[PDB]
Amino acid sequence: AYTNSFTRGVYYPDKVFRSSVLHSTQDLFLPFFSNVTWFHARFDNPVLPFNDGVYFASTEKSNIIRGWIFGSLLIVNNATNVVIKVCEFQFCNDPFLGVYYHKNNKSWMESEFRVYSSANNCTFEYVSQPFLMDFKNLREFVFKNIDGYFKIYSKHTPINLVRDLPQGFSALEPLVDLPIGINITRFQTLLALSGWTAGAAAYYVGYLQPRTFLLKYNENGTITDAVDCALDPLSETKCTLKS
Amino acid sequence: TECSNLLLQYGSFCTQLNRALTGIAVEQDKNTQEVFAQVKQIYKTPPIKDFGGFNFSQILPDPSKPSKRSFIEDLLFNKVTKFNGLTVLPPLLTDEMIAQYTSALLAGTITSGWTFGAGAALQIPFAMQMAYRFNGIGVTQNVLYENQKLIANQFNSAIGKIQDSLSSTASALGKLQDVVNQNAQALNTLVKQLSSNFGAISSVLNDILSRLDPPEAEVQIDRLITGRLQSLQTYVTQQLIRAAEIRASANLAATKMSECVLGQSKRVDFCGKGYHLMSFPQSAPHGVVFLHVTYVPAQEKNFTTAPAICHDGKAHFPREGVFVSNGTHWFVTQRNFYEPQIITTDNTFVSGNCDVVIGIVNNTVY
């Protein structure tokens, strides 16, 4: 299925603070109002091409989306904390992270990891801080692999929808950037999970495209609005006039 | 320093660029001086403001504020809104000095008329001065004195409307705002041009020098020099083109000050639309504003007219005016204002017979 990415997929391209300006960035973004692919967590965890980076949304409760496989590579946002590990993992054909759904714990506690079976040639590993195990927030992620430098962006924003992307604006503050320097030609999504009922978590895939994209930095250096150079003539004239 | 030696191979392209820019800068001071330094002395308006009913309070300087700037001048200033070897020089005449010149020009016009622009300032009551202006547009001077209250009220209302037009709308000063924008983007484009490779490996000389030996670094540096030198040439050429455009505008403003403010202009549509009476200069950022006081005829009515009249076998022509009829009676009136009066032998002159003029009528001259 498909839905509309109204005004999402906007992040901070670079480590620059600019105040009360409108900056135009030829960058790898998510087109506005795009027919973003729609999967359901029925369970859908297929392998998809990681062509020119990829976006990822997650209306996540109980930490359904717990990892991703690129390359062998993983970004396993497990319960404890984010764990990015670079090795020649022997990924399973159906990789995921298992969760015991309130199995007498009255809490969805992660207890399994079928993301991979073994690691042979490890190159890198990073472990971040822990976080709350919790939907009323639209966690969104972006993943890029340019010049070997592997970049990850995300933001934690409250929302009030159920299964559709809200028509609001948010900016994904960068969280990680690693020199894994591997070849990423495909990817897959690891989610919470013999015999299961996957927790309701609308998670999307938007194949980002290289496109000019005008960003409005408020006086605080936090992006407040943005437009495109190809959404429509109105947007085009705005970007030409930088207004 | 590695580049500076390279740049010497180009000779004196840069003594030329600085000569061109310093020539432009010196001109900008000449433009302002020509337009505003039009008055020999700094005339001051008297404390008593008995100007026959005209209040110029909205165009005369207001000493309450620090700048001693007029009220309308304040509205104009509000409406109009050192990186890489680029410096902006300050104008020779400060904004306060310019506002003093306009005050002197304005004060001279109110108290002296056009006399102060042709010699010593000779005072004359403003109401009597306006009688000169009416007489100078073909309207007798009794119409001003008879309608002095109305004319004064019309002037005050017209001046009041200019405040609203400027204060309410910020797009009135497009011409002055455009000049500011053009210069601002010319510098921004010039500075942004420092971030382009021009074909070199990078736009930063430190990177070129760091990542290459002098032989192959020199060639890369030369690419940057040519591109940056070329971009600096186009900036100077554009400024020279713009400077000529502004000089033409400044030359026009200087002529308008001389002919519209320092006198009464018979040139049509030069000092406003209609019949020129007065003009009041106001100072604006990087420019000037003229308030053209103009006499516009209104409320016309049809009449039957003749070229001359037959009285006693001889044709009578009007000394200065027109022959008009009520449909039953004939009068002689001034052209620009219906003031009929008995057609007599004092306001007409006789010349020739009755059988050479086409349209002759047969009225009587008293």
Place this chain on the structure above:
Amino acid sequence: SALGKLQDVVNQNAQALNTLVKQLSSNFGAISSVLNDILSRLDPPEAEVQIDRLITGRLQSLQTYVTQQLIRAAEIRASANLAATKMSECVLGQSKRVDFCGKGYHLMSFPQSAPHGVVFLHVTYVPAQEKNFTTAPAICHDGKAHFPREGVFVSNGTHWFVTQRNFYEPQIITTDNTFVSGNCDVVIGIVNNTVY
């Protein structure tokens, strides 16, 4: 220093030519700035890479000179147009335009040729030795207001006359110097007097 404008034109043109010639002594990255030296030292394959550097250098400097001349010729034409206009309506006639023919009331102008320019001798009438008088818009005579047909009413202090505008030539106020318009009830500043 009176003929600064004419001299400035000569100085600007000579200066521009000098820089153009001085540019012929630049290397522009070539081994030498003398074209003969490159030809007499290097074979054609290696002379072209050097002669090409000079060609771009000479060509660019020449282009800069030409564009500067075009802009400079534009302002000279604007000055020649102004000088042509002045000769037309300032020498060949009397102009009412203020300050177009010198400071004062223009009377006549005379042209004098100068090197690469013209000089106008503007003859103007400037009034002098002004005196203070009390004046009135009009005078009430017999319940009717009289206005100066061409004049202004002035008072010696006791007597009222009618001078012209800008040369004190007092005259007795008669019905020939003035015209009547209405009664003396609507003009502010009317002063009683007698019209001979």
Place this chain on the structure above:
Amino acid sequence: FTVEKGIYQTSNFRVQPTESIVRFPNITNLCPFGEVFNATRFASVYAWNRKRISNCVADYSVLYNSASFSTFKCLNDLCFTNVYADSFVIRGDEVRQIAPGKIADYNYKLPGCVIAWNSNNLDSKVGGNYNYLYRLFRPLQSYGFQPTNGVGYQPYRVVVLSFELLHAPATVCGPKKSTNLVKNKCVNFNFNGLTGTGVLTESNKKFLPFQQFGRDIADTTDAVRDPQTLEILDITPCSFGGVSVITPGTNTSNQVAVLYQGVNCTEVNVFQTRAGCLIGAEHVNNSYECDIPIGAGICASYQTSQSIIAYTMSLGAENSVAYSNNSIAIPTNFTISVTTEILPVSMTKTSVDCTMYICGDS
């Protein structure tokens, strides 16, 4: 050799950077090379464990400049993807075998740098050491040792650092020296490769928890956050400007004043003006007609003993017309004045041809 009266732009002033500030982020997460060379225990040559490391600050200078080694057969200015730092002990003359030998063909094979150190200090057991295993041929039987050994039979703890230049981005970057931070002084600043000139001060802007740099509309860098400490520093352009010389003319005098356009007189009779700093001219409260335009309403002139004075130019006499509603001034005389107006009409007709100018009979 003679200059007429006026203002002339002679040279260009620019505050030379008192220092070139370089502020690399604080050297932390030190690479574990400190303990690789003297680990509590080392494996055999054939059992060489790979201590591949990534994203560590490997300080080769301290290791290279240690004076506690045996052979440095090879650094802090180069960064690499990883360092396959080996660990083993070889018997004396086997050190030369570790180079691009029994060890070179059986236990180790070097296709980086080699570090060796006297192993008799710690590894050599007293009374006979046999913990290590030696591959005699390529086969593991024993190594053999004796505390009373020479140099060719003495073990050497050797760690082989093999740098990598794979397509993956370099991650093992050596320490980079950093200057200190000095504010309110023109100094060249380079925190993370952003080199530039500017006066460094404390700014009021608040950066995003992640953002490091700051830029203006013209893409120029204006404010930076020190990588070592979270201080928001505004980088103003380093003081500079033209130097112009006021001269009344050699025909009159040889005394001159110097104007530094756009400076505070702190970076250079010193008079501060809106147009810059005046040196050699004395400020006078009187106001005269402008002689030499300094700028911003300030003019300079030569007057009486003699000296150059800077003053605020006067626009003219402060005349006040004796206006009243019933008074008129009427001239009683006149003057005939003949003034002059000079207008350029034409230039010189110059013609130039390329082939003569550009090439010339060539």
